Design a protein around this ligand. Structure first.
Ligand SMILES: *c1cc(=O)[nH]c(=O)n1[C@@H]1O[C@H](COP(=O)(O)O)[C@@H](O)[C@H]1F
Ligand SMILES: *c1cc(=O)[nH]c(=O)n1[C@@H]1O[C@H](COP(=O)(O)O)[C@@H](O)[C@H]1F
Lengths: 330, 322
């Protein structure tokens, strides 16, 4: 009755992990230039304490790109591999956050935008991060808010689900839901994949289209949620242990309440806690489901920019779990 | 330092078209080029190697400069890189004299990992050297802090002139895409208004605000944000993606926003009507109606001739409209 790592649908992988660690913390890994630069500076000041810990972890030997470089001594990188120094410290920063925080994470979400601005080098890092998370068996989300015509988006499907072997991604369906047939499904291989579509976002002006536009007294975010679930049903996702879920911001309390009320069993991904100042108690309460994996609370910068990310993660894990307990003991 | 508005106008004066050539090479296109080049003694690669501009690409130039016979024996790990990059150079070399702009869709450059991003960088370098105005089509959207990374990638790293953006999340994101307050830099973008996919009506037309369809609302907000940012005073603009199969919308947008910049994909592979699109979207400054053609050029076995006939037809249609 046992399924091996990598050989099950995302719904099953999330449920198993949720049973294991009893939380809905989603850790965001969005390293910026200052993060990387700082990591390098700190490691140089402390004889690379964290990099040396990274290098003892067994699965570093199972990443795809430039292991030859990643496994070098840090002082050899600095002295002998100058053109690889950035790749090295960027990738080791990522492994460091993962190693420090993974025991608290239901899922990691990596936002593509942070991995592209230096050109190809960050995509090598991103591939290694995904290979590493696959080896640890931690559920993954690639946050890329993708959108195009079907013929174009199948390239993103290949990158996200074949190359990175991601469990899921985020999608903006404003163009249409028909794009989902080329993202959540591969007709050639007959494989199904999971996604979170944008419903209500955290940016301060998100109401401008998501709540102002309507059809017959239903606001755009409700229509968009319904259309996404209609497409999920058509594609048979949940019967293949995948899903289409919703991104609903952690500062959008009324919309979280409406979505959980009107779509009782939907999967919700909620960014906005920490750096963006959303209210965790209100968000988790309004979006609560007794299957906690259906209300992922994403926290990025408030963990990754803390000097002690393991402790920051534990603190959020504990805060979330205390609110989960309040709801279980309602 | 020209500004995209100025780049477009000056190039329009030199080549007298509004053809925008799409460069979206897929795996089959690359494999076909490789196969064909092998069978025809690398005729096009050899032509590529004679062009001056190749000497100015940033990434792995020495690889790109090697003879194909040598690449396949002594740099085999670089074989895909080499043929992918050379396909792009071949298309650009064969068609550039007919292009007001080139538009590269990011999705085609990512699915193999980092390797395609090096190709994409070299492509922007090559176009920059040819001083051809550029668009990165990536339909970006996120919160402000996140999209700054796309501003850097697109406008600092690639040095693109412009990009496409999806503002459904909100318009304020444009402040962190089309503007860099630190450096006092301004950049141009086209925002999604009416798209070519067959179910595009579902949100763009069927949603409304006080009896105006969503696409009109979105277009107006994009121009509102352009005004706020003072783009046009800095020789830049926010414009509209309007499908070349969306005649009513193109008609309405050109009527209601008389001086707007439109990018129109959908001719060729997606069936759109060239005469109707150019007519409904027409402006005397015809750089304001970019007609994008991707696959109908790149998947044509005779791409110079395909580009030539779109150039010629656009020019006949432009004269009809005056
Ligand atoms: C995406 C959608 C949205 O509505 N908000 C939002 O922030 N995003 C992305 O989510 C995370 C937030 O991380 P943080 O904890 O550091 O604020 C980023 O990846 C952002 F791009
Ligand atoms: C983007 C928006 C849109 O409405 N339609 C559309 O096709 N796109 C992108 O535009 C071009 C079309 O190229 P084609 O000439 O090969 O059809 C592609 O880059 C597509 F992604």
């Amino acid at each position: 009755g046992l399924v091996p790592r990598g050989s099950m649908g995302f719904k099953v992988k999330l449920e198993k992990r949720r049973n294991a660690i009893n939380t809905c913390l989603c850790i965001g890994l969005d390293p910026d230039e200052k993060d990387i630069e700082n990591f390098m500076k700190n490691e140089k000041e402390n004889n690379y304490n964290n990099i040396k810990k990274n290098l003892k972890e067994k699965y570093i030997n199972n990443v795809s790109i430039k292991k030859d470089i990643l496994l070098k001594a840090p002082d050899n990188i600095i002295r002998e591999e100058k053109s690889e120094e950035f790749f090295y410290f960027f990738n080791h920063f990522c492994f460091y956050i993962i190693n420090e925080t993974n025991k608290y994470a239901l899922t990691f979400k990596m936002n593509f935008a942070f991995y592209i601005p230096y050109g190809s080098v960050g995509i090598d890092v991103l591939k290694n991060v995904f290979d590493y998370l696959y080896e640890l068996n931690i559920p993954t989300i690639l946050d890329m808010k993708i959108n195009d015509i079907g013929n174009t988006v199948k390239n993103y499907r290949k990158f996200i689900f074949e190359y990175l072997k991601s469990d899921s991604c985020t999608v903006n369906i404003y163009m249409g839901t028909n794009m989902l047939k080329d993202i959540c499904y591969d007709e050639e291989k007959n494989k199904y994949y999971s996604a979170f579509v944008l419903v209500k976002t955290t940016n301060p002006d998100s109401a401008i289209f998501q709540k102002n536009l309507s059809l017959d007294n239903k606001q755009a975010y409700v229509i968009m949620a319904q259309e996404a679930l209609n497409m999920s049903s058509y594609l048979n996702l949940e019967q293949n242990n995948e899903f289409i879920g919703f991104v609903v911001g952690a500062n959008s309390y009324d919309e979280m309440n409406y979505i959980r009320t009107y779509f009782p069993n939907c999967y919700i991904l909620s960014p906005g806690i920490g750096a963006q100042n959303g209210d965790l108690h209100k968000t988790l309460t309004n979006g609560y489901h007794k299957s906690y994996e259906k209300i992922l609370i994403n926290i990025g910068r408030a963990i990754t920019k803390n000097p002690y990310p393991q402790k920051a993660a534990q603190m959020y894990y504990d805060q979330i779990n205390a609110i989960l307990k309040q709801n279980m003991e309602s």
